[PDB]
Amino acid sequence: SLEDYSVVNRFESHGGGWGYSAHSVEAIRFSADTDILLGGLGLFGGRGEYTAKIKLFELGPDGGDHETDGDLLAETDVLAYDCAAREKYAMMFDEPVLLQAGWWYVAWARVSGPSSDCGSHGQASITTDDGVIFQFKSSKKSNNGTDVNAGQIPQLLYRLP
């Protein structure tokens, strides 16, 4: 049956709604202090029918202090999705990607559709129940308001090796 994955939720609350436009890009920088297998990203929807393409970029060990344009590690095609109000949709990469402890990455999503749910009270640091510490920082690739505090990409979906 479907393989189970752990979740890290970067937001502690919700906002009003979030809108999209023709070239909107949601992105967030992150790092985990432990090697993890990244399977996908959790996305808000909740108020209709959406599409999204997701990407993962590598920045490296210095990517928290100096954001380069990064190296593409994974990408999906555009895929339609929906989910219940307040919930997240699990958009999976074609294959999971092994991330290195202390290295920085960019989680990226190009979402299209009507207004959606969104996050607020986003956290710079989250410690998951298994003890892994995730850090989040705003990304220069994000052009539609998503940042460390607010917006899209509420979750990373991962397993421990």
Side-chain angles (χ1 to χ4, degrees):
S1 51
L2 195 61
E3 185 175 40
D4 296 310
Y5 271 85
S6 300
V7 174
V8 56
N9 288 294
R10 75 191 191 87
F11 298 115
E12 294 188 351
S13 190
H14 61 275
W18 211 253
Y20 306 96
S21 52
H23 301 289
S24 289
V25 171
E26 325 300 325
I28 194 71
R29 281 186 287 168
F30 73 92
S31 179
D33 73 344
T34 301
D35 289 1
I36 63 176
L37 285 162
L38 185 71
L41 304 177
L43 303 178
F44 289 118
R47 315 184 183 191
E49 295 300 314
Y50 304 89
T51 71
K53 161 189 293 281
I54 60 170
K55 293 181 193 305
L56 178 68
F57 298 84
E58 196 184 69
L59 302 178
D62 302 351
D65 297 304
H66 311 290
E67 190 173 10
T68 60
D69 292 329
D71 295 327
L72 184 68
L73 296 186
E75 67 183 349
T76 64
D77 293 326
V78 180
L79 187 66
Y81 75 97
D82 64 21
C83 58
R86 312 172 172 78
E87 302 296 349
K88 293 82 158 182
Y89 176 79
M91 189 166 283
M92 309 305 285
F93 292 108
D94 298 343
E95 298 297 337
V97 182
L98 184 61
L99 311 186
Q100 303 179 68
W103 284 32
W104 285 79
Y105 300 88
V106 184
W108 181 109
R110 191 164 166 217
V111 177
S112 304
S115 67
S116 73
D117 295 329
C118 64
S120 76
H121 282 74
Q123 300 297 301
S125 292
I126 298 287
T127 305
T128 43
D129 293 340
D130 55 17
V132 179
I133 301 172
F134 290 86
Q135 295 180 64
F136 296 95
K137 292 182 186 298
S138 301
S139 172
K140 71 189 195 178
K141 295 187 185 300
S142 196
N143 69 17
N144 187 41
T146 290
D147 64 18
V148 64
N149 304 125
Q152 262 285 13
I153 320 180
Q155 304 172 329
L156 310 178
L157 311 178
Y158 75 96
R159 288 177 60 90
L160 298 176

